[PDB]
Amino acid sequence: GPMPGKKVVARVEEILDGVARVKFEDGTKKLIIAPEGVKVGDVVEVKKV
């Protein structure tokens, strides 16, 4: 079961026009939309609104 209070983060491997290819904790790489100011090598979080 997902751990309560655990933040979810991914590493930015490639980015173009606000769309980042990120590596998740399990090592899987996927495209996501990322905010402006995010560069390759930066870390992003997935958080509940």
Add this chain to the structure above:
Amino acid sequence: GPMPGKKVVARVEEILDGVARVKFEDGTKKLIIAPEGVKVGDVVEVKKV
């Protein structure tokens, strides 16, 4: 170019064991890791750490 100060959010369509299928603003649906407490119908954000 990505708009500066614009938050990135996605809608949670399906979730299981901390892995959500979310719909991005463009309508594309993808699996992501999501924090504990995220249920179907919730909204998540992608934010720089």
